[PDB]
């Protein structure tokens, strides 16, 4: 995202407003007759900008627009999220959860795990068994495994909405009991 | 496998009348060892199970995005409001004798993935078989009945 | 791919309860939880049966059949 000087509010503020969000939702709902408003509109009107690893050296980015942007009681269970005590941001993250990979976005709460376990899943979710394509009946793949009843996960991630994981699942919601029942 | 690297083979299969059960009659699909959780420090399996239980009760799929403001206390309050214990434990009963289990069992739905390493594609036996053309020694591979 | 006939845990028949659930969501503007509760699925083991099922045959049946009479 782009942070402007924004002299109206007297502090740094993102260029995107609720109007652009409403227009994006309107286009997203018309696709599923209004004026088309897609990612090219955000890219061409200065609302978002492409930053590579070169420009990340000489910029300053914020986690959330709702916390690190405005000038500053706390929940006893919420994590300590620092606001960096400085409001001079020139860019803002669209969402931090988009630092993950594809099969590492399958993990429910990857920040609540030890990182080797996230690596083991992200190299193990490829090894899962489930429906891969919807035309598996007409494909002569050398090996193919299809679950009978693939169920979309109960605890899901927003990121797998765009990965079509709820449309093509790779597992089942098993009733897990964490117990030492018989020693097997 | 879980969605947290908690892979493992099937130890044994019990029928329903042997395998333990809660007071609501819900016999679990799958019993996992407690000792696998804290050595690996896998907490997201527990929170995923709690959120999935709340999602199954309320009928709305649970958000498990990494960096949201969703804590264990809120999910615990929702599970308490749905009529179960706040931390997900249920008082279950032994299947063999019907006596209550002295310790309460963490319980609930959790997304598991079946992995391709079936036992049928890995079992191997050979008493005698085809030898190699070069060294007169048993051949490579389980498809060719090798050593 | 289509709805299982029975809950794997408890065994209550839910294969006849899928089109009713889709009917309740489609035209009555209901939440999923209340519609699931009205079908008599009070245990969450049966609730993850209908809530979490994806209807894959709606994507399967769009292909033409291999043999047509």
């Amino acid at each position: 995202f782009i942070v402007e000087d924004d002299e109206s509010l007297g502090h740094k503020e993102l260029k995107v407003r609720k109007g652009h969000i409403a227009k994006l939702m309107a286009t997203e709902y018309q696709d599923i007759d209004v004026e088309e408003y897609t990612w090219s509109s955000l890219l061409n009107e200065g609302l978002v900008e492409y930053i590579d690893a070169e420009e990340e050296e000489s910029i300053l980015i914020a986690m959330q627009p709702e916390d690190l942007e405005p000038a500053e009681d706390v929940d006893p269970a919420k994590r300590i999220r620092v606001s960096h005590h400085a409001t001079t941001f020139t860019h803002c993250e669209i969402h931090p959860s988009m630092i993950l990979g594809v099969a590492a976005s399958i993990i429910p709460f990857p920040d609540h795990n030890q990182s080797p376990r996230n690596t083991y899943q992200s190299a193990m979710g490829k090894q899962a068994m489930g429906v891969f394509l919807t035309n598996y009946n007409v494909r002569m793949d050398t090996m193919a495994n299809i679950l009978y009843y693939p169920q979309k996960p109960l605890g899901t991630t927003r990121a797998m909405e765009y990965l079509k994981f709820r449309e093509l699942p790779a597992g089942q919601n098993a009733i897990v009991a964490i117990a030492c029942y018989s020693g097997y | 496998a879980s969605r947290h690297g908690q892979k493992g083979t099937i130890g044994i299969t019990y029928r329903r009348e042997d395998m333990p059960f809660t007071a609501e009659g819900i016999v679990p699909d799958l019993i996992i060892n407690p000792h696998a959780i804290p050595s690996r420090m896998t907490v997201a399996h527990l929170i995923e199970c709690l959120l999935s239980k709340v999602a199954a009760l309320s009928g709305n799929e649970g958000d498990a995005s990494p960096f949201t403001d969703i804590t264990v206390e809120g999910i615990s309050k929702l599970l308490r409001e749905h009529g179960y214990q706040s931390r997900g434990f249920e008082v279950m009963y032994n299947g063999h004798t019907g006596k209550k289990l002295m310790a309460q069992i963490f319980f609930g739905p959790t997304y598991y993935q079946r992995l391709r390493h079936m036992v049928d594609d890995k079992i191997h036996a050979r008493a005698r078989g085809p030898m190699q053309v070069l060294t007169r020694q048993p051949v490579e591979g389980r498809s060719r009945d090798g050593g | 791919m289509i709805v299982p006939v029975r809950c794997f845990s408890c065994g209550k028949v839910v294969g006849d309860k899928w089109e009713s659930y889709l009917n309740l969501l489609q035209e009555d503007e209901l939440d999923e939880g209340t519609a699931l509760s009205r079908l008599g699925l009070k245990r969450y083991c049966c609730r993850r049966m209908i809530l979490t099922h994806v209807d894959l045959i709606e994507k399967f049946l769009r292909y033409n059949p291999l043999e047509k009479r």
Binding site: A26, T156 | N60, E61, D69, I70, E73, G74 | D31
Partner: peptide
């Protein structure tokens, strides 16, 4: 605490009501 659910169907109904 915030609601830990993905309920976009009610968001769909609310946005179609807004339009």
């Amino acid at each position: 605490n915030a609601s830990p659910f993905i309920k976009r169907d009610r968001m769909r109904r609310n946005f179609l009501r807004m339009r």
